[PDB]
Specification:
Two copies of one chain form a homodimer.
Chain A (H helix, E strand, L loop, with lengths): L2 E5 L7 E2 L12 E2 L1 H13 L3 E5 L17 H7 L5 E2 L7 H4 L2 E3 L4 E3 L1 E6 L7 H5 L5 E3 L5 H8 L3 H12 L9 H10 L4 E6 H8 L6 E4 L6 E3 L2 E3 L5 H13 L2 H11 L5
Parallel strand pairs in A: 1-4, 1-5, 9-10
Antiparallel strand pairs in A: 2-3, 6-13, 7-12, 8-10, 8-11
The complex binds (S)-2-amino-3-(3-hydroxy-isoxazol-4-yl)propionic acid (2 copies).
Chain lengths: ~260, ~260
């Protein structure tokens, strides 16, 4: 009956505590989703174990094997009972797993090294000196791969065939690439992560332009899971009580470093 | 099998066409939700009839009779098969009807007559010369009635006992009150409606401060309805294809009058 929670090491949702090596179990972790997990478990009356997704991915269906990877896969194949992470609600995922209503609203955005002469996706698409990419799997990459909108289709055509690869394995790698590329690399990632990093030292990045879309993160469970109903009601209650807003402030701005 | 759609006359979601008196059926109406209804019906393969909610309300449980009114009530009592309108996803409603994932994101906001010395909810709560209210039923009024947050609790205590009443029957009445009160009345309504009105003549209102919360509108169906699954997938597809963003631009800004 201990609920197995799959999540991902993504700041500031789930991070290793500074003294994690001296701790064990759930206590090794801290962050927005660690706090959210505790709140959801309290309101739903369950005990849980936090586990970091084995392959470190969000979740996508492998085009060759048709097998789902990441957190989505752990739910699909019964390795975890629930996913509490910044997992984007998308059509392809909705078809295979259940999602609570959004606990956070967001959109794809552009991260640049301060001073980079870019203000929008259109700007990126109309030039070649500044390379740009996305996480190598997940909703952002899929957004571009499937887009039929002129600007985005043009961006995908460039990104997919760009060499060396413009895609990264983790958000942290994308941020590092922006910071080390002297303005010659821009990273496409969710506004939530972008806004967080903008308030972290060395305070050398900036979110520019409006978001490309409007979507949300949902707490996921295996399709048909009896846990889904209570979890969804918990998310709505937590949002209405102002807890979710308090948590974003706690992990994004209260201790901002810039 | 013709699907009965309940909706509400709320600009720019559903409005009477200028020549409505010479037309009949669905063709009498136009707006964001009229377009959305057509798209959803197309993707789900159903024919429908648009009907305007009899009591003109969004939906709340009468504390005396325990009977649900508005669009929520029409779904609860089987008078309509689906609601396609700016119906806010809330905990109390989620418990009695089904909701698709959000088709629009929004939050409670403040509408003022241009020049009014108010920039936030806190400002409103710390003064008495400028009266303020909400729709007389629905998620915004409930937000304040149930709030345990200092500023909002203080605002509710004032609003509920204010005489004459600071509540209005329709969004249009709230807007008119702001426009005719010479800056002595501020209206609390959803950002979506606020942003729309700001671009309508006489261009004398303004949205001020940040939103008080973050939530969304969902397409609703009776609890357990077989129509829910397809409708939800349709909303996600329409959002991912960029249609929803196109529709907001079409009805909010493309023909803005300011
Ligand atoms: N939340 C996204 C992944 C993601 C995180 O930040 N930018 C991204 O692209 C997903 O669920 O794939
Ligand atoms: N969408 C809300 C009503 C509403 C519309 O605009 N401001 C409001 O308060 C609801 O569903 O009650």
């Amino acid at each position: 009956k201990t609920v197995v929670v799959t999540t991902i090491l993504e700041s500031p949702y789930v991070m290793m505590k500074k003294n994690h090596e001296m701790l064990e179990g759930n206590e090794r972790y801290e962050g927005y989703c660690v706090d959210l997990a505790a709140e959801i478990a309290k309101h739903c009356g369950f005990k849980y174990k936090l586990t970091i997704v084995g392959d470190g991915k969000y979740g996508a269906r492998d085009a060759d094997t048709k097998i789902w990877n990441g957190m989505v896969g752990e739910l699909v194949y019964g390795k975890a009972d629930i996913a509490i992470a910044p997992l984007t609600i998308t059509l392809v995922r909705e078809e295979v797993i259940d999602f609570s209503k959004p606990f956070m609203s967001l959109g794809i955005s552009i991260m640049i090294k301060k001073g980079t002469p870019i203000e929008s996706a259109e700007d990126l698409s109309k030039q070649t000196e500044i390379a740009y990419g996305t996480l190598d799997s997940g909703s952002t990459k899929e957004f571009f791969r499937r887009s039929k909108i002129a600007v985005f289709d043009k961006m995908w055509t460039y990104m997919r065939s760009a060499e060396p690869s413009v895609f990264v394995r983790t958000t942290a790698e994308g941020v590092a690439r922006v910071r080390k590329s002297k303005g010659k690399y821009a990273y496409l990632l969710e506004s939530t992560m972008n806004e967080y990093i903008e308030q972290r030292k060395p305070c050398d990045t900036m979110k520019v332009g409006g978001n490309l879309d409007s979507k949300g993160y949902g707490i996921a469970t295996p399709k048909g899971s009896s846990l889904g109903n209570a979890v969804n009601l918990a998310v709505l209650k937590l949002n209405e009580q102002g807890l979710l807003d308090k948590l974003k402030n706690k992990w994004w701005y209260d201790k901002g470093e810039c």
